[PDB]
Write an enzyme that holds these catalytic residues in place. Structure first.
Site, PDB file in Angstrom:
ATOM      1  N   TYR A  45      -4.547  11.431 -10.106  1.00 49.24           N
ATOM      2  CA  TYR A  45      -3.335  10.841  -9.549  1.00 49.24           C
ATOM      3  C   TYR A  45      -3.607   9.482  -8.978  1.00 49.24           C
ATOM      4  O   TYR A  45      -4.742   9.146  -8.619  1.00 49.24           O
ATOM      5  CB  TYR A  45      -2.712  11.729  -8.445  1.00 49.24           C
ATOM      6  N   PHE A  55      -2.269   3.783  -1.721  1.00 46.96           N
ATOM      7  CA  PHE A  55      -2.959   4.474  -0.646  1.00 46.96           C
ATOM      8  C   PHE A  55      -4.114   5.314  -1.110  1.00 46.96           C
ATOM      9  O   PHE A  55      -5.016   5.542  -0.319  1.00 46.96           O
ATOM     10  CB  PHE A  55      -2.030   5.244   0.287  1.00 46.96           C
ATOM     11  N   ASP A  56      -4.120   5.791  -2.359  1.00 51.63           N
ATOM     12  CA  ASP A  56      -5.249   6.579  -2.844  1.00 51.63           C
ATOM     13  C   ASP A  56      -5.142   6.792  -4.343  1.00 51.63           C
ATOM     14  O   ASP A  56      -4.061   6.762  -4.923  1.00 51.63           O
ATOM     15  CB  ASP A  56      -5.276   7.932  -2.137  1.00 51.63           C
ATOM     16  N   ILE A  75       1.097  18.757  -0.051  1.00 53.73           N
ATOM     17  CA  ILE A  75       2.481  18.516   0.347  1.00 53.73           C
ATOM     18  C   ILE A  75       3.458  19.223  -0.590  1.00 53.73           C
ATOM     19  O   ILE A  75       3.175  19.502  -1.761  1.00 53.73           O
ATOM     20  CB  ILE A  75       2.812  17.012   0.444  1.00 53.73           C
ATOM     21  N   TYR A 101       5.009  13.839   4.184  1.00 53.87           N
ATOM     22  CA  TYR A 101       4.374  13.872   5.514  1.00 53.87           C
ATOM     23  C   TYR A 101       5.379  13.740   6.644  1.00 53.87           C
ATOM     24  O   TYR A 101       4.976  13.668   7.822  1.00 53.87           O
ATOM     25  CB  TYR A 101       3.297  12.806   5.620  1.00 53.87           C
ATOM     26  N   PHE A 118       3.990   8.915  -6.781  1.00 53.62           N
ATOM     27  CA  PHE A 118       2.752   9.316  -7.442  1.00 53.62           C
ATOM     28  C   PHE A 118       2.905   9.257  -8.954  1.00 53.62           C
ATOM     29  O   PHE A 118       3.947   9.641  -9.513  1.00 53.62           O
ATOM     30  CB  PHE A 118       2.367  10.776  -7.099  1.00 53.62           C
TER      31      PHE A 118
END
Length: 128
Positions: A45, A55-56, A75, A101, A118
């Site tokens: 991902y 972010f990642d 999540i 979140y 995502f």
């Protein structure tokens, strides 16, 4: 770009029909079967905030992200979204904060009340 397109043209995949998780299938996977609850799923991902910031990404780690589906290990948007995927599928998922979140965020990178984007590739799924 891709986040705008899934926002405007994505499918609501929630059972509540609240548009909290929107999806577009980008690469069609194999056959028909989707994972079942409790399966060990392997994904790649990348995630971005609504301000454009990445972010990642598991690709940057050279290893997949692995979790047990439908167990609250990730999540809500991911339990819901990954459950809809075929092996080899790539999708885009827009996640409103109530399925991500929430007001807490995830410190430090993910702020309060964040809608997340995502791209997700389902590599494999296995029962144990």
């Amino acid at each position: 770009g891709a986040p705008a397109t899934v926002t405007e043209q994505g499918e609501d995949i929630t059972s509540k029909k609240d548009r909290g998780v929107l999806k577009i299938v980008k690469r069609v996977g194999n056959g028909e079967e989707t994972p079942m609850i409790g399966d060990k799923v392997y994904v790649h991902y990348k995630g971005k905030l609504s301000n454009g910031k990445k972010f990642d990404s598991s690709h940057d780690r050279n290893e997949p992200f692995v979790f047990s589906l439908g167990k609250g290990q990730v999540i809500k948007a991911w339990d819901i979204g990954v459950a809809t995927m075929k092996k080899g599928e790539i999708c885009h998922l827009l996640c409103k904060p109530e399925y991500a979140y929430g007001s807490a965020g995830s410190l430090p990178k993910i702020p309060s009340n964040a809608t997340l984007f995502f791209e997700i590739e389902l590599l494999d799924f296995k029962g144990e």
